[PDB]
Write a protein that binds this ligand. Sequence first.
Ligand code: FES
Ligand SMILES: [Mg+2]
Ligand SMILES: [Mg+2]
Ligand SMILES: [Mg+2]
Ligand SMILES: [Mg+2]
Ligand SMILES: [Mg+2]
Ligand SMILES: [Mg+2]
Ligand SMILES: [Mg+2]
Ligand SMILES: [Mg+2]
Ligand SMILES: [Mg+2]
Ligand SMILES: [Mg+2]
Lengths: 108, 86, 92, 46, 96, 99, 70, 137, 23
Amino acid sequence: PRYELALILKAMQRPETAATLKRTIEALMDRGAIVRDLENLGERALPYRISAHSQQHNRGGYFLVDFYAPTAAVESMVEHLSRDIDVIRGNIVKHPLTQELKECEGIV
Amino acid sequence: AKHLKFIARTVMVQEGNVESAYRTLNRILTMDGLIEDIKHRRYYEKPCRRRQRESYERCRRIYNMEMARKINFLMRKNRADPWQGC
Amino acid sequence: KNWLKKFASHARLRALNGLLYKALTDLLCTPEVSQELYDLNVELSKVSLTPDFSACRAYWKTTLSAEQNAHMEAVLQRSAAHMRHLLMSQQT
Amino acid sequence: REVLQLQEEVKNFITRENLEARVEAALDSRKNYNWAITREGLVVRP
Amino acid sequence: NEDLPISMENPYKEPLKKCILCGKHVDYKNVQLLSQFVSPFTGCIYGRHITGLCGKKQKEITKAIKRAQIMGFMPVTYKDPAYLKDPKVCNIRYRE
Amino acid sequence: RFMEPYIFGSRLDHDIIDLEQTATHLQLALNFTAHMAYRKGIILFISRNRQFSYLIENMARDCGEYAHTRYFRGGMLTNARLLFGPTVRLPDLIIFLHT
Amino acid sequence: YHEDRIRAKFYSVYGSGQRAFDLFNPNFKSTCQRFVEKYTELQKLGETDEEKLFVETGKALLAEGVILRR
Amino acid sequence: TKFSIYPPIPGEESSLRWAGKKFEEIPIAHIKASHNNTQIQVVSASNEPLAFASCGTEGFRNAKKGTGIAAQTAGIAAAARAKQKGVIHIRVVVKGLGPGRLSAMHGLIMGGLEVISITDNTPIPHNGCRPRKARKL
Amino acid sequence: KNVLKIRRRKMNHHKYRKLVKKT
RNA sequence: AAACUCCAGUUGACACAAAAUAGACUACGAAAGUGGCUUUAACAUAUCUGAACACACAAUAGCUAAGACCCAAACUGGGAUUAGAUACCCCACUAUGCUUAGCCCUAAACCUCAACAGUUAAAUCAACAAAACUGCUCGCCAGAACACUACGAGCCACAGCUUAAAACUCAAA
Ligand code: FES
Ligand SMILES: [Mg+2]
Ligand SMILES: [Mg+2]
Ligand SMILES: [Mg+2]
Ligand SMILES: [Mg+2]
Ligand SMILES: [Mg+2]
Ligand SMILES: [Mg+2]
Ligand SMILES: [Mg+2]
Ligand SMILES: [Mg+2]
Ligand SMILES: [Mg+2]
Ligand SMILES: [Mg+2]
C-alpha cells in the first residue's frame, strides 16, 4: 500500500544529510518500495530532548518520504531505521491522502 | 523531564503584583483540572468507584443544566400582574 | 443507575476533627470549589464533629464588615454540598 | 482515469538514477503543512 | 379544489450547523492547527464543550494530537510558544 | 391527541383548526344554548382566563345569566346542598370559554 | 403550498423585506407576495426553468420600481 | 506594549531585562512544599546552589514544621542567605500542594528577593506508578 | 429482593467451610 | 513514636511497570472485557429458534514452572493507641498484580429484562422496577428449610467445580 515515512534525522551538514537520505531511500527500494517523492520540512528544535544511539538531541531535520511498498516491507524497514545512527526517530504511517474524507451533513 | 523549562505552567508578574500572578496560576491549574488530578492521585481510586463517580457527576451536570434551563424559561412570566383585581 | 429519578425524586473524634480541619482549609486554598469562594479568602478556625457523627461544624472566622460577613455566609452555605462531595471523592 | 493519472504521475517518481539529484533538490526546498483555522471556519495560511 | 396543501418537504429547512473544521483535513503534521485545541499552560487537550467541535472532528483532533506528540512533532506538557499568537477558537478564558 | 380530528394541519409547527368543522360544532352548541335559554334554564359561564374575567362577567350580567370566573372552591356542584342550601337549584347548562 | 418554494428562495436571496408586515390588514401584500404573483404569471405565460423565472421576475419587479437588494 | 503573561522564549529575542540580565539568566528559587515540610533552594541559571533553607533546618519540629509560619521563616532565611550572594531577582518554581506553597513565597519576598515569574512543577504522572490505598479512618 | 436468603446462604457456606477444614 | 541519614534539594542519565488531558464521548466485541503510538492480520451467516454435559470461550482470585521487579499489597515483623487492639493510624517487606507455556472454570459473570417477529389498538395497568401486549421457539419453575448440602457420576480440579436429593420439622415462608 501507500505509506509515509516521517524521519527525524541528526542535525548534520549538507553532505552527511544527503548521504543519510540516499541510504534511507536505497533501503526502501531494496525492500521493494517505489518512492514517489521526498519532502524536506526543515531543520527545527525538537519538541523535547530525544536520546538515541547513546546521544542526546535537541535539534533535528524533519523529512517525509512518500512511497508504495508491500506489506512485508514495513516491518523490515522499521528494523533498518532502528540501526541507522543518523536517524533520531523514524515512523512509517499509512499515507493520509489514502484515508477517505467522508462528507458530513453537520451536527444533528 | 525532557521538555524545555519555564514554559509549562509559568506565569509572569506584572508591576510586582506577585499575589495576582499566583492567584492566576491557581485559576489556570484549577481550570485545566490539574489541581483535581493531584488531589485525587494521593490514594488509589478503584476502577468501579471511579466509574460510579464519573457517571454521577455527568448525570448531576445534565440534571442541573436542565433545571436551570427550565427556571430561565419560566422566569419570563415573572413580572407585575397585568390583570390585577380580576 | 437511572440518576434522573433519584435527582428528581473521644480520641477518634479529635483525630477526625483535625483531619477534616486540614482538608477543608486545603480545599478553601484554591478555586477547586468555585472562584467566588476563592476570592473571598475564607479562613477556618476549627472543625467540630457532633458526637453521633450527624454533622460536621466548620467554624469560619468572621470579619469586621457586616455585608461581607453576610455575603461570605451565603457563599459558604451554597458551597457546602460541593465541598462534601469533593472531600469524599478525594478519599480523605 | 485512475490508470491515466497514475501513468502521468509515475513520470515524477524517484528512481535509482535521479536519486542524487532529487535528494539535492529536496535539500534545497522547504514544505509547510502548517495552517490555522479562524472562528468563522476560514483557513489562514502561514 | 386547488387551494388544498400539497405534500412537500419543508422548503424553509435551515441547513444543519457545521463545526469550524467540517470538510477540512486534519493532519498530524499540521501542528499549528492542533495547537489551537490545547491548553497554553499545560498542553492538555480541550473537551468538546470548549472546542465546540463535533464528535468526529474532536476524535480526529485527539488522535492527530497524540500521534504528533509521540512522533516528535508536538510538545506534550505545553503549547509550543510559536503558536501562542494564533486565532483563538476555543471558548475558555483564564482572565490572564 | 383527542383534538387531532379537528385540526386542519400544522403550519410551520403551529396547528390550524379546521373552521369547516368549527362551523357545524358552533351551530350545534349555539342551537342547544338558545333552546336551553328559551326553556328558562340557568346558564353558568366558566373561565379562569383572567384577561377575560371582566368581559365574561359583564356579558353574563347583560344576558341575565350567571358567571364564575374566579377560583373554583371544591364542591360547588357535587356538594352544592351544603354550600348553598338544601334547596339550591344547580345550573341547567355550563359554558366553558376556557376549559 | 407550491409558492412556498419560491418564498424560500426569495427570503434567502433578497432577504427579509425592509418593509414591515401588517397582519391586521386582511389583504396585505408583501414584496415577497408581489414577487410570488409575478413569478406565477411568468410561469403561466412562459416556460418552466426556475432560475430564468427568478431573474425575469426580479427584472420585472425592478422595472415596476420596488427595491430588491441581494 | 501589552504585558505578556506568557514567559519569554529563550530563542526569540525579547527586550525584557532585569538588572540588565535576561529571563534565562535570573536565579531560580525551587520550592518543594510537602505535606509535612517545605524546602527552599536558590540556584543559579547555571545550577550553582546558592542558598538552602527548609522548615526543619530552622528549628521547627514535627507538626509545627508543616505550617505557614514555618514556611515563612524558611523563605525569609533562604532569601537572606541568597542576598548574601548577589541575588535580587528570582524565578519561582513550586512543586507540591503543601501548606507552605504560598507562605514560602511570602517569606522570600519579605527577605528581600524580587519575584518575576511563578512556575508550577508538581509531579502529575500520566498514570505511571500506583498510589497507596485510601485510609480506612 | 430478600437479603435474608443471601445471609442464610452466607451462614450455611461459612458453616460448611469450617466443617471441611475440621475434618 | 519508630524508620532512614549509602539522608534530603537542583541538574543529567535512566523500565519486561501502567497508560493525565481527550472522555461533558457512549464506541467496539458473543460475553468476559476493551480508553498511550505505529504497522500487519482481522471482527461468521443473504430465513429464525436450537445444548449444565457436544465444540469453542469466560473478570478478579487461585495452582504449576521459568523470568522481570518501580509501585501497590493479603500475610509477617516493628511503632503508637486502647480496659484489652496482633483491627483501624505510621514504617518495612512477601505470595500476588506483570511476561512466557500450561491449568483452574468461579462472580451483584446484573439492564437482576432469554432469542427472533409484530403492534400501539384496546380495559393502560395488583404493586414497585423499566409504558402495555401479541405470535413462535428453547431453557427453567411448582410451599419453607434441610441444601451453593449428602450420595452417585464427570472433570488436569484433591479443603475444588458441575449436576443434585431424601429422612426429621413447620404453618407458614
Ligand atoms: S460538523 Fe461535519 S465534520 Fe464536524
Ligand atoms: Mg443459532
Ligand atoms: Mg437439556
Ligand atoms: Mg455453568
Ligand atoms: Mg479465568
Ligand atoms: Mg513482590
Ligand atoms: Mg448491575
Ligand atoms: Mg437462547
Ligand atoms: Mg458457588
Ligand atoms: Mg461426591
Ligand atoms: Mg460440591
